[PDB]
Amino acid sequence: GKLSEQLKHCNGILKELLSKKHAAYAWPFYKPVDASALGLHDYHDIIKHPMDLSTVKRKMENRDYRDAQEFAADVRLMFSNCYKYNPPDHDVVAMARKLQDVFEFRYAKMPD
Numbered sequence: 505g506k507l508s509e510q511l512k513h514c515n516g517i518l519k520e521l522l523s524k525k526h527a528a529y530a531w532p533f534y535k536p537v538d539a540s541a542l543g544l545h546d547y548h549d550i551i552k553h554p555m556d557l558s559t560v561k562r563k564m565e566n567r568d569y570r571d572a573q574e575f576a577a578d579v580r581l582m583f584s585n586c587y588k589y590n591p592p593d594h595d596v597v598a599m600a601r602k603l604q605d606v607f608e609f610r611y612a613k614m615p616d
């Protein structure tokens with residue numbers, strides 16, 4: 505259960521993404537997209553591999569990530585699903601972008 509130095513960094517990023525500091529734009533990402541509740545027609549046809557922060561959290565807490573690139577691929581998938589489904593002017597796309605800017609900058613500062 506001991507994380508590598510790179511995955512400890514990633515755990516730090518995840519905790520920041522889930523923190524009150526980012527909650528104004530992170531909240532739509534805290535749990536899987538409920539397509540039924542939202543009426544997102546054909547969400548699960550268009551999005552083959554759903555992802556959200558609760559999923560990333562589970563993988564990290566269970567020590568299931570093999571490396572940092574796996575973590576980054578999941579977080580990027582979460583954002584790319586959002587951009588792929590939604591129109592460019594939707595509020596959730598703006599929120600995704602704000603959260604992704606936090607992620608990309610912090611991830612880039614991972615010790616190599």
Ligand SMILES: CCS(=O)(=O)Nc1ccc(Oc2ccc(F)cc2F)c(-c2cn(C)c(=O)c3cc(-c4cnc(C5CCC5)[nH]4)oc23)c1
Nearest residue numbers: 531532533534535536537538542585586590591594595596
């Ligand atoms: C906490 C997870 S949840 O149980 O599914 N709750 C939830 C609540 C609000 C969500 O997004 C919104 C953001 C802003 C807004 F004004 C409305 C939202 F539905 C979203 C939401 C998250 N993600 C990742 C998305 O990609 C989308 C897309 C949409 C969405 C809602 N209405 C549309 C339009 C029809 C296509 C554009 N898209 O809502 C979410 C989810």
